[PDB]
Each structure stands twice: as C-alpha cells, then as structure tokens.
Amino acid sequence: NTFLSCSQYHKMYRTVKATSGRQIFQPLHTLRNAEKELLPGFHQFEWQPALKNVSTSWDVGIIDGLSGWTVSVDDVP
Amino acid sequence: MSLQPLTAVNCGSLVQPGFSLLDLEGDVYLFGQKGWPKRSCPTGIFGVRIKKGELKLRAISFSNNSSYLPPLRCPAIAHFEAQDGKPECYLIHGGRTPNNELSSSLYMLSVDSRGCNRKVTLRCEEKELVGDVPSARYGHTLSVINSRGKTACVLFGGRSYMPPTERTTQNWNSVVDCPPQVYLIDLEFGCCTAHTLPELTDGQSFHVALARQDCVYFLGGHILSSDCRPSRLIRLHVELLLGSPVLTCTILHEGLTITSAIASPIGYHEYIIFGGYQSETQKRMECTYVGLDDVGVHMESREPPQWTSEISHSRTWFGGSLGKGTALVAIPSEGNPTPPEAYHFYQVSFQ
Amino acid sequence: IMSISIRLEGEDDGITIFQEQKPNSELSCRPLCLMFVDESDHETLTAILGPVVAERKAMMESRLIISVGGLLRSFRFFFRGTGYDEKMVREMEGLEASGSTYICTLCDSTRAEASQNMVLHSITRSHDENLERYEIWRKNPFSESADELRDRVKGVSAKPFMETQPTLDALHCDIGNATEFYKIFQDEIGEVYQKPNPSREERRRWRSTLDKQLRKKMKLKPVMRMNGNYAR
Ligand SMILES: [Zn+2]
Numbered sequence A: 001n002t003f004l005s006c007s008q009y010h011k012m013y014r015t016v017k018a019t020s021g022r023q024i025f026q027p028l029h030t031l032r033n034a035e036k037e038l039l040p041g042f043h044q045f046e047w048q049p050a051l052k053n054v055s056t057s058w059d060v061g062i063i064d065g066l067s068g069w070t071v072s073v074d075d076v077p
Numbered sequence B: 001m002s003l004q005p006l007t008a009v010n011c012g013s014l015v016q017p018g019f020s021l022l023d024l025e026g027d028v029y030l031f032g033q034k035g036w037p038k039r040s041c042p043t044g045i046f047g048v049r050i051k052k053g054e055l056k057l058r059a060i061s062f063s064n065n066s067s068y069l070p071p072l073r074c075p076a077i078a079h080f081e082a083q084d085g086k087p088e089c090y091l092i093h094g095g096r097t098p099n100n101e102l103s104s105s106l107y108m109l110s111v112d113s114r115g116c117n118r119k120v121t122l123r124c125e126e127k128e129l130v131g132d133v134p135s136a137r138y139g140h141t142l143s144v145i146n147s148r149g150k151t152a153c154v155l156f157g158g159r160s161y162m163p164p165t166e167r168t169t170q171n172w173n174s175v176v177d178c179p180p181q182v183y184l185i186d187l188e189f190g191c192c193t194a195h196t197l198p199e200l201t202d203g204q205s206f207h208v209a210l211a212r213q214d215c216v217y218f219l220g221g222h223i224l225s226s227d228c229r230p231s232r233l234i235r236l237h238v239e240l241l242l243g244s245p246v247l248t249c250t251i252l253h254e255g256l257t258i259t260s261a262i263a264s265p266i267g268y269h270e271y272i273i274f275g276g277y278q279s280e281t282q283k284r285m286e287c288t289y290v291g292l293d294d295v296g297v298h299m300e301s302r303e304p305p306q307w308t309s310e311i312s313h314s315r316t317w318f319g320g321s322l323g324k325g326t327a328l329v330a331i332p333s334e335g336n337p338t339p340p341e342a343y344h345f346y347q348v349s350f351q
Numbered sequence C: 001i002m003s004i005s006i007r008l009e010g011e012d013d014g015i016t017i018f019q020e021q022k023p024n025s026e027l028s029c030r031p032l033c034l035m036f037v038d039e040s041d042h043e044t045l046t047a048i049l050g051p052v053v054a055e056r057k058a059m060m061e062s063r064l065i066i067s068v069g070g071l072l073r074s075f076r077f078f079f080r081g082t083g084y085d086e087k088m089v090r091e092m093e094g095l096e097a098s099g100s101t102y103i104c105t106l107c108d109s110t111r112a113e114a115s116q117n118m119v120l121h122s123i124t125r126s127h128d129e130n131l132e133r134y135e136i137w138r139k140n141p142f143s144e145s146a147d148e149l150r151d152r153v154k155g156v157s158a159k160p161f162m163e164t165q166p167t168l169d170a171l172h173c174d175i176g177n178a179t180e181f182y183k184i185f186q187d188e189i190g191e192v193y194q195k196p197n198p199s200r201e202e203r204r205r206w207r208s209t210l211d212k213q214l215r216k217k218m219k220l221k222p223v224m225r226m227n228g229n230y231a232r
Helices: A006-019 A028-035 B309-313 C042-057 C086-091 C111-116 C127-139 C146-153 C175-189 C200-217
Strands: A046-048 B002-008 B020-023 B028-031 B046-051 B054-059 B076-080 B089-093 B106-114 B120-127 B141-147 B150-156 B182-185 B193-195 B209-212 B215-218 B234-241 B244-251 B263-265 B270-273 B288-293 B296-300 B318-323 B326-332 B343-349 C063-068 C071-075
Touching (some): A006 A028, B020 B318, B028 B318, B076 B150, B089 B141, B141 B209, B141 B215, B141 B234, B182 B244, B193 B244, B209 B288, B263 B318, B309 B326, B309 B343, C127 C146, C175 C200
Parallel strands (some): B076 B141
Antiparallel strands (some): A046 C063, B002 B343, B076 B089, B089 B106, B106 B120, B141 B150, B150 B182, B182 B193, B215 B234, B234 B244, B270 B288, B288 B296, B318 B326, B326 B343
16 A cells, blocks of 8 residues: 555664664565465355356466467467 | 569558458459448458559459458458359358358459449359368368369368367467368359268468379468478379269378468469468568369479568568569558558569 | 445345545556457457456356455346447447447437437446347348348347447547537637638648637647647
C-alpha cells in the first residue's frame, strides 16, 4: 500500500528491531510465505460439471500469455 | 539478378509479415491486409504498382454476385489454367483470419470486366466442399493438375491445432503438424477425397511445391515433430482411372532444405527462387533456379544479387513476385525512429 | 467483482447479499492480464485474449464449488462486458469505424433517420444477431452489390469475437453536449437562421466576443478542447 520496496523494507526492519528491543514488523521470507496464501493458485475448488476444454489442474499461478506459441522463426514471431 | 531499394510514398501502415500476390489480366494484386478492412476499401485486396521506383496502392472492387472474403493471413495459393469454363481463376484456401482460426473453405477469384476508366472488376465465388472434407489448417500447399485430361487439384501440408479434446487453454496457441494425407479436390463437384501412402512418412509445412502434367514434386520445408528439415524432395504421379482417382508416391534424393521460399516464373516451367530460411536462425542467402520436366527437376545456383548490408543483417524477411522474373522482397525496417512504416522494400529482377 | 445475490429456494429471484459501494475507485479493480502490445493490431490482441475469451464462455454454464466458510457451496455467474471505450467497443463488435452512417452502438439507425426522430428507438443490437449479420455479409445469399449489401447488413462488416453488452460512457457523457451548447452560444450571438451560411470570419468573431463575455461575467478563460471541469 505504499510502493515500499524489499531492500527498503528489510533495512527499516533491522532498523526498528535493533532500535527498540522488540520485533515490530516481520522479516521478509516469513511475510512472503504468508503472502503465498493470497495470490491465485492456492485454494482447492471443484466444478460440476467439469469445465469444457480446461486443464483440470488447480494449483498453477502466474502463467505466460503466449499460450505455448511455437517459437519457430518462419511463422509469425 | 539486380536489386534496387524502393519506398512506398504512402500506404505503408497496411502490410503484415504474411500476405499473398496474384497476377492476372495485367496488374498485380496484394491480398491479406493487416486487420479487418477499413472504410477506405471494404475488399482489402489492393492493386499494387511500381511506378518510377515508388510503390503505389489503389483499391479493388467487385461485382454484386461476388462473395466477400476476410483478409487471410498465410493461406495456400493456386493458379487455374485459363480454359473452360471461365478463364481464368485463382483458388485460395484457407489460411487464418485476423483472429486465430482457420477457414476450411475453398474460394475462387476471377476477373470480370474493364475498365471502364482503367478500373478493374473481380469476383470471388465460394465453393462448398463435400466429403471427406479436408481438415482446416494453414501454411499448407495446393496445386493444379490434368490427368487424361481431367482437371483437379492436390492438397498437402500445413500445421493445425490440437483437437478439442486436448485443446489446452495454456497451449491454446500451440500448433502441431496435421498427419500426412494427400487430398484430391475437383471443382464441380467439390467432392474432396483423402488418401495416404506409406512413403508419406510425415507432414510438414512451408514446403514449396510444384507440378507439371499431372505429376507433382514437393520441395523443401521444415518438420517440427523432429525439429529437422529433411532434404527429401517428394514425387507423386496422379491419375483418375475413372472412376478411381489413384495416386502413386515416391521419395527422391535431393530437395533443398530451405524453408519459406519466394518463387517467380521466368518462363513456362522455369522458376527463380529466392528462398527464405535455410536453418533455424541463419536465413537463406543464395538464389537458385529450377527447371523441371519428365526428365526431372534440374537445379542450378544462379547469381545471387548482392544484398545491401541493412538487409544482410536483419533476422527475418519476406516477399512476393510481381510476375515474370520480377520480385519484391521486404525486410522489417527495424530502426530509430519508427516511421511507423517498419518495412524496407527491394525490387529484384532476373538477368 | 460487482455483486452477489441469492437464488434459493422458492421464488426469491434475488436478495442482494452484497453490492459494491464504489465500483469506480481502482482500489477495487483487479487485474487479470498485461500485454506489451498496442491496442492497434488485431493480431496480437486476439492472439493473447483467445484463451481468456474461451474460458469466459466455458464459465457460464457449469457451477463452481467452493470450500468457503467451512461449507462446500455452489456458484453461478452472470457476465457483463462493459468497460471499453468507443474505439475498442467497435473493434470488438465488428462495426466499421468511426463516424460513418452507423453511429449508435445500440440503435442501428443512421444519421438521417436519427435526425427525423430522436427518441423512438428500441435496443436491437446484440452479439449473436451481429454474428448472424456477419454470416449474411460474407455469403451474400442474395448476391447484392457491395454498398447495398453493407446497408442490408447494418454496420456488421468484420466477424466480431468478444461478446460484450456495451453501455453509454459515464465519463465523457457531456463533452459533445458541451461543444453543442458552445456552438449554440456562438451561433446565437450570430443570427445564424437569419444569415443561414456564414464563413470563418464571423465564426472567430462570435467566438471571441462570447469568450470575453464569459470571462467578464462568470470569470472563465476560453479553451481549445473541452475537458470535464470546463464543461461542468
Ligand atoms: Zn433503439
């Protein structure tokens, strides 16, 4: 919510923790592990009846929109 | 075998990497304009002219009886010999649209009248196909033949999509090679037929083909399933031993292993060939000539017109032939700043 | 996500369990896809959005089962395609562009018939019937001439691909009205129906005197283009 970048975050984190005797914020790795529960591809579900020509997999995340574009130079790039 | 740089005074925002060129009754027509037709010309087909080294583009028209065609991307081309019933015609099928899907429909383009005031008039008749219909695809090959002495056509080549069973919305833009079946196609009726011979080891795409006197030779292209580009030039001999349209196939030794070629007839059965792409990244460079007869196909390495540097460096390129040795090649004019006309053009002549 | 209502179990066609309180603030607008390609080419845009469109189609009928709040619950969706601007609106409806005889995205009337009457118009446009008109245009099962066929097909020239119920833009929604009232004032300082056809001189004259008048009484500078706040 404030564009705050990772290097910054870690810096001010060490800063405030070593500043006043406490752990106010959480370090990155654990914050991000906790995050992984908010992006797409984390909850199970089902669909009745099954979708038409849609991969039954459910755990995927950030995909590439080329959709497997056969990279052969000759054709449209 | 000389090259000279041309430029389009205008009408530059409208040439996609694929397109086709037909010649008939004098002038030459470009087909397959990028995106759908604007208001300027609802047909999309453009009369293309070279005037004093400049490139000019005017609009084309149609009759009322004409059936209107979308701007296919990279379909197959075929010339119907001028005779009864209507000389002459060009058969087009089927390529893909400004959207990603195939036509699976045969169309026949002809010229009707002129001028009056140096205008030209055409028409496009769709021909329904019954069968035993050929599968929709693109980048395949089609050619015309006469077997004692009846006139028909042969279809072979082209990739396609996975069936709507493994049609996967994460590979939904992947292509795969259609199985290697030859197809026989008459015009009236349009009853198509599917055939296969064991020497048809595999289908491929972008393999230029040619034929003479109802015998057809497929030249070099590229296979994706094995990532290779087989030098197998393929012969087949077709005959309608009425009422059985029987074919016989065979593999020949030498076929040039380049892909996506550009061809111009300098005479009756002679073809100067620019060729587009030999290897996976190294584009084709040489300039070849093909004669052909019952003796066979004879090949020669004609003099390659000495390219410029800016063309010698770009990755890919394309073009067509205005007719009779004449030809146009086009390179992505990748530079700064973008005009936005991103395509340089070279006129190229034989002898 | 716009709204959620109920359908169980009797008549109960809908109880709005949740309606969004402010759909405009980007705070609530979730992204789905990003593409480093201009809206210009139809090629790349269809190339990428194809999977998306086909998915949206395959997502209307079947019912989604969610493990929500500890319960396995069933979900159906209704889909509106709205947030497009006129340019792409056409570009995904198959109409020509831009200001030709066919002007209204809903009332397929032309300019002249919209000038005869201005409010008797029934919403007849729909994605399916436009698909049908495209088939009509391509086959031409009557072999009608070019322009006459384009008339009998009513704007449908290119196969549309993206079902989307368009709506009036709530953003501009005023700018043509603004320039119209502006022309009204400029031609009312003139006696335009007393001198029916004036040239550019009296045009610029009326403009300048009107703008000095507005600056004098309401204290507003003249402008070249009409944004929102100037119109307001
Ligand atoms: Zn209406």
